[PDB]
Amino acid sequence: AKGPLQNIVTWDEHSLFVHGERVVIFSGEVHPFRLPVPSLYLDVFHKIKALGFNTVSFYVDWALLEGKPGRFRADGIFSLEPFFEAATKAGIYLLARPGPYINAEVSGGGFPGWLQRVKGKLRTDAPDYLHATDNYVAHIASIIAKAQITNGGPVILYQPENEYSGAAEGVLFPNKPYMQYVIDQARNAGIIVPLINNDAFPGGTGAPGTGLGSVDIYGHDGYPLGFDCAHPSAWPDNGLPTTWRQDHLNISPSTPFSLVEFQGGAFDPFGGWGFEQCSALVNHEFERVFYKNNMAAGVTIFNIYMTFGGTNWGNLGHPGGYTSYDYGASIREDRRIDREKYSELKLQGQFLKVSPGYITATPENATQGVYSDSQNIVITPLLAKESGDFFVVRHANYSSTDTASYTVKLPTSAGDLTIPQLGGSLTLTGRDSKIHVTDYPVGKFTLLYSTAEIFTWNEFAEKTVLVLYGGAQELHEFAVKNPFGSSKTAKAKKIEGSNVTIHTTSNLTVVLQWTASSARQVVQLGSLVIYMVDRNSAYNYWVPTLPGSGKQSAYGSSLMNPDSVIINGGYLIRSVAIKGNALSVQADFNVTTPLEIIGIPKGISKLAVNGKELGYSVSELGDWIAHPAIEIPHVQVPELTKLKWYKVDSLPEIRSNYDDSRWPLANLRTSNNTYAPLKTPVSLYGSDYGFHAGTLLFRGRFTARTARQQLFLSTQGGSAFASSVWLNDRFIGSFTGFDAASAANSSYTLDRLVRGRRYILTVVVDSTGLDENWTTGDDSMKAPRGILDYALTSSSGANVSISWKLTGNLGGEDYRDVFRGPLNEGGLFFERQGFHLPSPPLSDFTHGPSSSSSSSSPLDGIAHAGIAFYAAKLPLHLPAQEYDIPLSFVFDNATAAAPYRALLYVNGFQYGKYVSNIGPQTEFPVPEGILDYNGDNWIGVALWALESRGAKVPGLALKSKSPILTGRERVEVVKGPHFKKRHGAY
Numbered sequence: 001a002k003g004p005l006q007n008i009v010t011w012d013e014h015s016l017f018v019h020g021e022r023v024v025i026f027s028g029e030v031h032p033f034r035l036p037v038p039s040l041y042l043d044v045f046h047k048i049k050a051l052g053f054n055t056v057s058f059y060v061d062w063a064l065l066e067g068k069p070g071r072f073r074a075d076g077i078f079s080l081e082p083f084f085e086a087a088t089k090a091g092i093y094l095l096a097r098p099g100p101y102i103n104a105e106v107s108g109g110g111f112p113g114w115l116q117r118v119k120g121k122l123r124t125d126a127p128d129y130l131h132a133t134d135n136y137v138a139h140i141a142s143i144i145a146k147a148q149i150t151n152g153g154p155v156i157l158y159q160p161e162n163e164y165s166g167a168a169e170g171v172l173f174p175n176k177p178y179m180q181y182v183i184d185q186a187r188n189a190g191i192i193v194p195l196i197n198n199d200a201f202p203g204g205t206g207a208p209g210t211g212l213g214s215v216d217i218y219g220h221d222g223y224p225l226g227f228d229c230a231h232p233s234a235w236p237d238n239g240l241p242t243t244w245r246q247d248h249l250n251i252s253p254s255t256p257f258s259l260v261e262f263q264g265g266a267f268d269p270f271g272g273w274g275f276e277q278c279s280a281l282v283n284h285e286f287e288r289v290f291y292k293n294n295m296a297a298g299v300t301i302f303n304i305y306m307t308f309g310g311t312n313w314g315n316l317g318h319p320g321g322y323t324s325y326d327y328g329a330s331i332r333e334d335r336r337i338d339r340e341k342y343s344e345l346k347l348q349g350q351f352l353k354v355s356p357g358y359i360t361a362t363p364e365n366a367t368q369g370v371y372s373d374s375q376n377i378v379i380t381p382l383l384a385k386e387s388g389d390f391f392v393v394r395h396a397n398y399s400s401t402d403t404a405s406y407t408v409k410l411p412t413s414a415g416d417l418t419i420p421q422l423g424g425s426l427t428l429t430g431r432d433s434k435i436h437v438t439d440y441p442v443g444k445f446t447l448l449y450s451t452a453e454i455f456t457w458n459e460f461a462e463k464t465v466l467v468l469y470g471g472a473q474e475l476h477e478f479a480v481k482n483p484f485g486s487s488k489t490a491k492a493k494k495i496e497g498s499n500v501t502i503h504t505t506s507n508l509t510v511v512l513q514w515t516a517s518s519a520r521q522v523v524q525l526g527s528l529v530i531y532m533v534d535r536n537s538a539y540n541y542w543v544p545t546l547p548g549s550g551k552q553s554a555y556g557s558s559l560m561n562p563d564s565v566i567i568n569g570g571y572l573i574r575s576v577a578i579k580g581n582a583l584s585v586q587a588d589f590n591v592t593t594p595l596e597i598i599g600i601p602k603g604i605s606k607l608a609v610n611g612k613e614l615g616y617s618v619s620e621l622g623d624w625i626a627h628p629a630i631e632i633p634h635v636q637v638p639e640l641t642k643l644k645w646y647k648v649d650s651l652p653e654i655r656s657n658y659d660d661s662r663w664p665l666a667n668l669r670t671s672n673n674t675y676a677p678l679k680t681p682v683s684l685y686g687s688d689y690g691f692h693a694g695t696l697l698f699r700g701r702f703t704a705r706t707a708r709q710q711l712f713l714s715t716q717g718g719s720a721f722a723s724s725v726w727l728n729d730r731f732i733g734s735f736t737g738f739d740a741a742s743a744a745n746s747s748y749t750l751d752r753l754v755r756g757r758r759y760i761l762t763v764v765v766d767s768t769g770l771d772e773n774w775t776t777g778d779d780s781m782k783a784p785r786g787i788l789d790y791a792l793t794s795s796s797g798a799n800v801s802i803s804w805k806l807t808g809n810l811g812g813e814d815y816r817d818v819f820r821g822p823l824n825e826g827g828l829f830f831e832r833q834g835f836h837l838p839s840p841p842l843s844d845f846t847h848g849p850s851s852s853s854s855s856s857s858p859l860d861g862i863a864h865a866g867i868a869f870y871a872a873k874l875p876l877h878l879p880a881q882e883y884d885i886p887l888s889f890v891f892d893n894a895t896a897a898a899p900y901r902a903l904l905y906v907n908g909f910q911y912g913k914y915v916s917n918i919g920p921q922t923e924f925p926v927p928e929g930i931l932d933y934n935g936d937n938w939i940g941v942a943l944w945a946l947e948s949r950g951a952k953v954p955g956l957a958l959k960s961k962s963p964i965l966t967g968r969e970r971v972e973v974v975k976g977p978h979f980k981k982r983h984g985a986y
């Protein structure tokens, strides 16, 4: 760490500077590879920009971009260019986090499965590991380098590595040569923006001052609330972080206090609680108490992990999670922004971006009974000589759901005051926290104090507007230094409301008291207009920024205090633009509402909403009240059970005529897997043969020595895997799986054999992904998939040899679907043939009447253990131009039903792994873009019946959410290749 390499993005003890402007970086985490629809990145960026955020943080997943060693590929849905372009179009900057290790609840933590064949320890300077990363970093860091702000792009910060924060016993840590090699790779590829790290906790690793391997800005992470979604109302003792200001001063006082990942939800395992329960844990209450507690410590680079989670499509996830990555985040997996936590987060983002005095105020120790007589609240001051103070108030027991009555005694430029000055008590209701301010600048005006929270303010050409809010029934008071200019006759004017009271002192400080309610109060003081609302009304206000000019026009006039228009109403305001005398608004509506526009730019006299001009009413304050057309239609979608379903056997391997001459031989007598030394005479680890994704199959030949033999089989597929075994066409048994099992020891009897005859065992082993590698020196990502051990013995105890063949996805690292990437397909027969792709060869399938013995529907299923694949055309004709209509596939989980596993495919993309006996996911959202809302789709369901009774899907339906009338940019269908007969398939 030796200072900035450029002068566009710089820093000091208090903040980043971008183009010379101090800024609070308020960022949301988005992972481009979890939303493979390029034209929807702008939708999510619009939703994050509207929170008041200025930045997005993103991972890149190496395993998707270098599935074949030596062949980096970031094209099509894997290109970052549409992601960068959308950031520029939205006016969002980016923190790039390309790893190589990212963790991220993705398969291998980002490491491609061929790292199982690297002997050295991962995330160390073992040269076989280091040099295995070089091609990926050279390519991805040069892509990121071109997108830097120094080249006119959105990238302002780069993170090397990920939570490099401790190691296994005996392993060098921190390994400074390792850390510096990782930095050098990025610098050598042209990264010149500052480097920021993300220590898992405040351990000091890589901080400035630590020499070799140090980054520019020390960052760390925090997930205090934890992940016990089992008990969403429980906030445990000592869960609130109380040491981070002092830890920051101890570790890196020269750089901004940075939380590079702060909890925005929780992951959820197989057999978990579901993301709705996680969103109830990490809810709006969590945000206002815990996020304001980070403001109490002066955070000025603050990223919320996750803000939009997306989906672990195409097997990209790790075994510790399932298909959904909704995360309980403020933006749902289907991109809806109806959770209350979204609107609460917007209040916080909009506050910070108009409050530059927050940056240079000094956070001090938390206090009790100092800034209030009350001991039942804790107050943390951020103090400044003249630029304004901030006071973060919480219950002393941070978990408390009680209501507290209090007053405060705060320092001001007019001396210390007990507030309310006009009588009465403030209220702090359960799991709330507030920021009170003193000497807060509002343009030319100054708030001597305010107990109500600030949503936004701006100086418009004819008035200054300030929007303040409280929770309902809270009494609040604020005071404005003489707002009347040289006038010694001017007075306050009540415009709306009958609750606000106003008292003016001899020096013309105006003191206003009001009790928040659903009825807005509005008072005009000179050219200052204050709108006083309750919190639930403030949730519906928006502050879109007015564009500048040129390529960077969407970044507006500045990052802090930008030129803006204030809009009351709407489910989303995406943007505003001026053209001539017209203000054009892009907006989404999920319910009817008026729109009230506050702060009309000079010279503008026309209004348009989503391209349609409309009139408006003008208020005495010059606000516009408009009533755009909002029709929310009934939507009908096709019944999946009435589609024309086609079926194909996807376990032809067990039929006596099956030829496996094309299958890879499992004949490697040694392995480079140093984490799981071989127990078997040949490797039966998928990754040793190039198979890293999805289900594996093994075929073991033996000659019977006795009529009865005993088979021991140890399989490993990752948490919640399963495995099934046949002897020729005879079902032997399944390990049916559970949340806590990543491997299984099974024992089976192979009876009634003909001595001297050859038999073939077919063993199917699912994989739920490769494990993460969070502890350096513990090569846990190298945990293999397949058969760990076996023993076949005759009835006299003799050992019986087995010779093996195996497969995963056809081609292995020479994977067949370059468009959908290296992990989308597993090894099941239908996948290997490409039968999951659009327009499959229906002559290879069967069709027959549902509920008949010739049924080809997944609703009728199969009457024996085995695996079938079902395909159907799903035409959709929905009004996607005008409406955002989220669609999802829902499986009915019938309590008494034989266990099965299913895979969901939509136009060739795998969009769901359903595990009927483990759960918890039953609803599988699929985005527009992957689905064609005005054309033919192909839907696929694989059904793996684990028990000899067989299985069926009890119910399968397409579900829609309420249509949202939308002003988004149009969604283009992703052009995934259709089926084509594969040469060399088996």
Ligand SMILES: *[C@@H]1O[C@H](CO)[C@@H](O[C@@H]2O[C@H](CO)[C@@H](O[C@@H]3O[C@H](CO[C@H]4O[C@H](CO[C@H]5O[C@H](CO)[C@@H](O)[C@H](O)[C@@H]5O[C@H]5O[C@H](CO)[C@@H](O)[C@H](O)[C@@H]5O)[C@@H](O)[C@H](O[C@H]5O[C@H](CO)[C@@H](O)[C@H](O)[C@@H]5O)[C@@H]4O)[C@@H](O)[C@H](O[C@H]4O[C@H](CO)[C@@H](O)[C@H](O)[C@@H]4O[C@H]4O[C@H](CO)[C@@H](O)[C@H](O)[C@@H]4O[C@H]4O[C@H](CO)[C@@H](O)[C@H](O[C@H]5O[C@H](CO)[C@@H](O)[C@H](O[C@H]6O[C@H](CO)[C@@H](O)[C@H](O)[C@H]6O)[C@H]5O)[C@@H]4O)[C@@H]3O)[C@H](O)[C@H]2NC(C)=O)[C@H](O)[C@H]1NC(C)=O
Binding pocket: 227, 228, 229, 230, 269, 270, 271, 272, 273, 320, 738, 739, 740, 741, 742, 743, 744, 745, 772, 774, 893, 894, 895, 896, 914, 915, 916, 917, 918, 919, 920, 921, 922
């Ligand atoms: C449809 O519908 C249906 C109905 O009808 C449904 O179903 C269902 O389902 C469910 C769910 O899935 C289920 O339940 C489940 O179950 C399961 C199973 O059970 C069974 O088994 C068991 C076990 O066993 C074993 O073990 C033992 C001892 O060990 C023994 O004894 C035995 O033998 C066995 O053993 C074997 O195995 C093993 C394994 O492999 C081994 O080890 C050994 O050696 C051998 O091998 C048992 O126990 C049980 O039992 C019991 O029960 C029974 C009944 O069944 C009975 O009979 C008995 O007696 C007794 O009683 C059985 O058997 C299980 O597992 C589970 O459990 C859970 O849960 C509960 C509650 O609920 C509890 O209690 C427990 O404890 C557990 O827990 C857990 O989980 C939860 C949830 O999630 C939580 O909350 C908690 O906390 C815990 O957790 C943990 O674990 C897990 C696993 O388990 C995981 O996952 C986790 O983790 C994760 O997470 C966390 C958060 O929280 C985090 O933190 C972590 O992380 C980490 O990591 C990362 C990365 O990776 C990093 O980064 C970071 O940093 C950190 O953080 C993660 O990982 C934790 O760990 C349950 O129970 C049931 O069953 C069913 N039912 C029927 C009727 O079926 C379905 O689901 C539906 N579907 C849909 C689609 O929806």
Ligand SMILES: *[C@@H]1O[C@H](CO)[C@@H](O[C@@H]2O[C@H](CO)[C@@H](O[C@@H]3O[C@H](CO[C@H]4O[C@H](CO)[C@@H](O)[C@H](O[C@H]5O[C@H](CO)[C@@H](O)[C@H](O)[C@@H]5O[C@H]5O[C@H](CO)[C@@H](O)[C@H](O)[C@@H]5O)[C@@H]4O)[C@@H](O)[C@H](O[C@H]4O[C@H](CO)[C@@H](O)[C@H](O)[C@@H]4O)[C@@H]3O)[C@H](O)[C@H]2NC(C)=O)[C@H](O)[C@H]1NC(C)=O
Binding pocket: 279, 280, 281, 283, 284, 285, 337, 338, 339, 340, 343, 403, 429, 430, 432, 471, 472, 536, 539, 540, 570, 571, 590, 591, 962
């Ligand atoms: C169209 O899109 C809009 C978004 O633009 C969607 O609107 C959102 O819809 C969601 C879902 O319904 C709403 O969230 C849920 O809100 C309910 C209702 O509570 C909220 O509103 C009432 C007013 O109607 C407030 O009084 C509530 O605030 C009190 O309670 C909360 C605790 O629930 C507390 O934190 C507050 O401080 C406040 O407490 C004060 O009053 C209470 C009650 O008297 C008093 O006891 C206390 O002492 C204080 O005085 C709150 O703002 C809420 O019940 C739901 O929560 C429960 O579920 C979630 C899990 O989902 C848990 O996290 C939570 O802990 C509860 O168990 C939700 O929060 C959301 O507010 C709403 N947003 C807006 C902008 O309207 C529409 O749904 C979309 N429509 C369609 C058709 O698509």
Ligand SMILES: *[C@@H]1O[C@H](CO)[C@@H](O[C@@H]2O[C@H](CO)[C@@H](O)[C@H](O)[C@H]2NC(C)=O)[C@H](O)[C@H]1NC(C)=O
Binding pocket: 233, 234, 235, 237, 397, 398, 399, 400, 401, 402
């Ligand atoms: C801090 O406040 C919380 C919330 O009021 C308290 O947690 C309650 O604790 C009681 C007694 O253990 C439980 O029966 C309730 O279920 C809890 N409620 C919640 C929502 O979790 C807590 O005890 C207080 N802790 C301190 C240290 O006094």
Ligand SMILES: *[C@@H]1O[C@H](CO)[C@@H](O)[C@H](O)[C@H]1NC(C)=O
Binding pocket: 117, 119, 672, 688
């Ligand atoms: C095992 O590692 C050696 C280097 O010692 C390398 O030559 C070989 O290619 C590796 N095997 C596999 C199949 O990757």
Ligand SMILES: *[C@@H]1O[C@H](CO)[C@@H](O)[C@H](O)[C@H]1NC(C)=O
Binding pocket: 714, 743, 744, 745
């Ligand atoms: C399987 O048994 C072996 C002993 O041969 C043991 O080492 C291993 O832990 C067992 N695995 C599981 C999942 O029980």
